[PDB]
Structure 1
């Protein structure tokens, strides 16, 4: 049994439910040919993510079994850990909340501006390349304090940076080195005084951060831009497809926009944007279900396994806005490495959806759904284009 099962992100394979039933932890083979334990039940997914003995940091260890080839320097795997040790965690998290003044208004204006141009241009429109991704890019430029016109350049690295490859990718290092050099220049730029890079540039000259390397400062910039843009852009794209497939829900959210956060939360739960399970390495012998995971073995946490688990989410395929456990999904992960951009991710989706439902209430696919081209061997499930009419 080889993972991943399908690059299609518009429907979950029937095999996932069967697997969760029969073998909630199963030996699979990754694209690199390595063994791994695939966990697909909510209970066991939660257990793994809340046990730090299943380590993220150690997934980059030498000779360790691999989900896929590294496309970043080995130390980037422990990036949030290095941020914490350098005493920068509070500052970073503050810089990436949607609660920043003028941020939500910027998202709203940007989303409306993008949609107005699509309408002016006329159907069909590509909701990924000309809405979801540009909105994600524009947002993270604003969050970092870097020029808007620098966005598309940094975005270009992402079709390679987030590949899920069996072998090392020569272009990944080339792009990484280039983007690092860009962020280093930003730190030296006196004009950059706002956002994440503005604050980092400030802390860089502060005595209490004298021994925090310039490497880490630039790395934070590159990492948060790439991870944030790819995650919010891809999720919003696949969420829009979920809405298109659900006219009844669309109208309801259109009619009662206060329900949109609860809707986005359900869209998060059923979202299939993650193409691979979350990788962890066992730093000890740990019992997981019917399996004793040995030290040094690779464990993959299948997010849709847990999120479509009927034992935790009854009628998992249905979007229900009144669930008693609405945010208990694992779309933002769980435990030590819970997504620091979760609130920003929610707000990006909510504002993008609200604007679209206002501007395009009759939005629908301009092509048969099977005509969507799903990107292969990639860390996200996305259609190359999302053609719509309205």
Structure 2
């Protein structure tokens, strides 16, 4: 027989039984990626946390030429160290401050947008597609607002992402085409005097500040493109599959409908059991490092399986159950951990909370309009998502 292949399944509505067997029998073990490369798959909470909190397991070095690869690059290799570059340009604080959900009127904008989308769906009548006509438009509108760019520019940038976040064995020509075009767009945004708010407005000001005279224009455009893409794909995909998790639990749906003050904790649990990341987080060992029973050698590829950690019964008892009163509710790895912890976590949380609150208020009887098995799960993608999410109410 051949070496165990990853990923195991593109389905985001259930965790494979094989994961628990793996965690119990071999919480770090050798696998083969789609490129043919070998890697260590880590699937226990303890070892996942160990790996993510040890910077000698490097994100940046995953971009090195000749390295074993999880998948082909869809960005310039320097972009792999994007946050690092941000840090080096002295821009980390401003960027992070710009993408919090705390800006005046941001949450009200989210609510208004969600409510408008839902009103439109209700007017059009069931069935409704909660991905293409709710979650993703909401994410896109949100990130246009956050970046300070026109709403009407959102869809076209959005249309890069189905390619931008592919997980391919080979390089993707369209990915480079779209990348260069979106980069030209963001550079134009930086030169556009009308853009004075949000992330791009702030970057536009800092660009002309003498304290930043030697930061490259490339980096400025790149922040815009990368944060738009990662933010929209992450919030859209998470919200979609969270809505799936919610729909499959009518009792929770009803409870949250009755006591919306419980919605954030619910969202936190929805975060914990979320399967949106299709692959483990990649890291390259820069030294010989002991992980459980395995001595990982310098230059080897390591994959941190988030659902491995988050469904670990040793950290989250009865892991498959949504429990709103856990003693350790935010200790999941849905936003990663350590050096590369998600800078957009608060915004993602608020996006999901407001989207769910609005949905439950508008569509308290929301349910799937097709049998669960009929959902079409996107393959070889960095996220797990159903192509369409047909619902009734």
Instruction: Tell me whether the two structures share a fold, i.e. TM-score over 0.5.
Output: yes
Aligned partner of residue 2 in structure 1, secondary structure: coil
Misfit runs of 4+, over 3 Å: none
* Alpha-carbon displacement from aligned partner over 1:17-58 (angstroms, at most 9, x marks no partner): 000000000100000000000000000000000000000000
Aligned partner of residue 232 in structure 2, secondary structure: helix
From 102, 105, 122, the equivalent of 1:102 is: 105
* Alpha-carbon displacement from aligned partner over 1:48-105 (angstroms, at most 9, x marks no partner): 0000000000000010000000000101100000000000000000100001100000
| Shift in Å, 1:169 | 0.3
Residue 130 of structure 2 is matched in structure 1 by: 127
* Alpha-carbon displacement from aligned partner over 1:210-246 (angstroms, at most 9, x marks no partner): 0000000000000000000000000000000000000
Aligned partner of residue 358 in structure 2, secondary structure: helix
Structural RMSD (CA): 0.3
Q: How far, CA to CA, are the matches of 1:312 and 1:178 in structure 2?
A: 45
| Shift in Å, 1:146 | 0.1
Q: How far, CA to CA, are the matches of 1:219 and 1:128 in structure 2?
A: 27
* Alpha-carbon displacement from aligned partner over 1:155-191 (angstroms, at most 9, x marks no partner): 0000000000000000000000000000000000000
Q: How far, CA to CA, are the matches of 2:371 and 2:249 in structure 1?
A: 15
Aligned partner of residue 167 in structure 2, secondary structure: coil
Residue 295 of structure 1 is matched in structure 2 by: 298
Q: How far, CA to CA, are the matches of 1:251 and 1:309 in structure 2?
A: 28
- Structure 1: runs of 5 or more not aligned: none
Q: How far, CA to CA, are the matches of 1:240 and 1:326 in structure 2?
A: 19
Q: How far, CA to CA, are the matches of 1:95 and 1:274 in structure 2?
A: 25
| Shift in Å, 1:259 | 0.5
Residue 324 of structure 1 is matched in structure 2 by: 327
Q: How far, CA to CA, are the matches of 2:293 and 2:104 in structure 1?
A: 50
From 22, 25, 43, the equivalent of 2:25 is: 22
Q: How far, CA to CA, are the matches of 1:315 and 1:369 in structure 2?
A: 23
Q: How far, CA to CA, are the matches of 1:387 and 1:258 in structure 2?
A: 27
| Shift in Å, 1:5 | 0.3
Residue 350 of structure 2 is matched in structure 1 by: 347
Q: How far, CA to CA, are the matches of 2:110 and 2:41 in structure 1?
A: 37
| Shift in Å, 1:111 | 0.3
Aligned partner of residue 322 in structure 1, secondary structure: coil
When the two structures are superposed, what TM-score results if normalisation uses the length of structure 2? Answer: 0.99
Q: How far, CA to CA, are the matches of 2:346 and 2:303 in structure 1?
A: 25
Q: How far, CA to CA, are the matches of 1:321 and 1:244 in structure 2?
A: 17
Q: How far, CA to CA, are the matches of 1:21 and 1:165 in structure 2?
A: 30
Residue 358 of structure 1 is matched in structure 2 by: 361
* Alpha-carbon displacement from aligned partner over 1:260-301 (angstroms, at most 9, x marks no partner): 000000000000000000000000000000000000100000
Q: How far, CA to CA, are the matches of 2:386 and 2:20 in structure 1?
A: 24
When the two structures are superposed, what TM-score results if normalisation uses the length of structure 1? Answer: 1.00
User: How many equivalent residue pairs?
Assistant: 390
* Alpha-carbon displacement from aligned partner over 1:283-339 (angstroms, at most 9, x marks no partner): 000000000000010000000000000000000000000000000000000000000
| Shift in Å, 1:355 | 0.2
Aligned partner of residue 330 in structure 1, secondary structure: coil
Q: How far, CA to CA, are the matches of 1:57 and 1:333 in structure 2?
A: 16
| Shift in Å, 1:116 | 0.2
Aligned partner of residue 382 in structure 1, secondary structure: coil
